[PDB]
Point group: none
Chain length 77, copies 2
């Protein structure tokens, strides 16, 4: 019958990503080749495709760290 | 003392390079990478160099053949 909840998810951090310098960083790719031959495609229900996705990437943050807190709750019945 | 030459280099040929068709020809390369680090170069006397010579080539003649006749002569003395 009766119910009582307490939910106090304290969190605390000091996420340091120190660095003095980066210097000579480079990204020097050569371009390859891709080819594809389908005939029919029927995508559905939360797709994220990548056909022929040639891609050269640089993702350099000066100081970096992702941080996640996925909280949830359910008391249906 | 006296001299007498005859030089009659007859030549005759029927160089056939027949073909009915070529069809599906392709040339599909991916681009690699090259790097070089010299400090000094002193070329001379009939050079033909190629530094970093990345190159994709197609050399398709429909019907082909070279043909060469390098004749010479000398009676100096």
């Amino acid at each position: 019958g009766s119910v009582q909840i307490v939910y106090k998810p304290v969190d605390l951090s000091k996420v340091t990503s120190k660095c003095g310098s980066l210097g000579n960083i480079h990204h020097k790719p050569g371009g390859g080749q891709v080819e594809v031959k389908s005939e029919k495609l029927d995508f559905k229900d939360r797709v994220q495709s990548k056909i022929g996705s040639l891609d050269n990437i640089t993702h350099v943050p000066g100081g970096g760290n992702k941080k996640i807190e996925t909280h949830k709750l359910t008391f249906r019945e």
